Amino acid sequence: GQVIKSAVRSTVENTVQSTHSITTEATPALQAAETGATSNASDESMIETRNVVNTHGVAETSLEAFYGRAGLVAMFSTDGGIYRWYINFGEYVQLRAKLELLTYARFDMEFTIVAQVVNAQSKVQDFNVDYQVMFVPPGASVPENQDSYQWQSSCNPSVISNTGLPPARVSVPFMSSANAYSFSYDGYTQFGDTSGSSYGIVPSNYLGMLVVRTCEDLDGTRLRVRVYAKPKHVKGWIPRSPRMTPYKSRYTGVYTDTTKFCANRARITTA
């Protein structure tokens, strides 16, 4: 079972007045990092302190406050009036790096879609057009064209809006077949295959794809789309060592080796 409790606080710890200490008994400053434990020396034991009723809160560092805001996860333009986006958050590094701070996490999500019409030279147009975003779960048929039958969307969820209306937005629940999404997986995607391409990816994190189209054909122009995602009701487990190297691939955590993280200085004795 759990031998270490986790009592909750809503403010940081206060400082209590302390006095001098000349003894052979209590030695707060002496530590032993070898144990694997972080020092337990308090301010009051290292110096003489005053009373400080500290009312500073801890809200902005809660998982909900840290993750509870939208970030870009997809950005693309239609081709032939259609685009197929496989749902995954490895394309854009900012949100990706945030999620990788936890090993496992459960959360609902709010997706927001911002779309505009652009021409061949990628210049934005003031043109209102209806667009459809359809969620195609794995196993369902993905439309090949802008007018394929799958767009009937009688079972697949779809959202139809217009570039002239406010951004489209819908919430999605925690959908994994697992009991938490995994942001680090030391294993393979299947039995009987040990090729590197199938390592480090947990399939249950892939819930399908979003296919987008304009309901009718645009003449010479395309639909530009940005998809934002915002985690909600976050529950997380096992904090991880933060990413310290640039991302190189969308599906793997491969990186370029380095001999330093921070820049060098002239000498260790000059701050």
């Binding site: 270490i4 909750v8 707060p28 337990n40 308090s42 809660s62 609902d108 909600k232």
Partner: protein, 48 residues
């Protein structure tokens, strides 16, 4: 800071539709900072 007069009423069927959680507490970090079997008091030496 936060309000003491906030109205929390859910308009939708699924909890996934609900707004962000409003707790935001922190907990004793011991399970991460001092995950040891034997208690080591701040006043004594760690190893003996």
């Amino acid at each position: 800071g936060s309000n003491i007069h906030y109205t929390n009423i859910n308009y939708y069927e699924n909890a996934a539709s609900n707004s962000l959680n409003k707790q935001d507490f922190t907990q004793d970090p011991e399970k991460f900072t001092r995950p040891v079997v034997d208690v080591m008091k701040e006043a004594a030496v760690p190893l003996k």
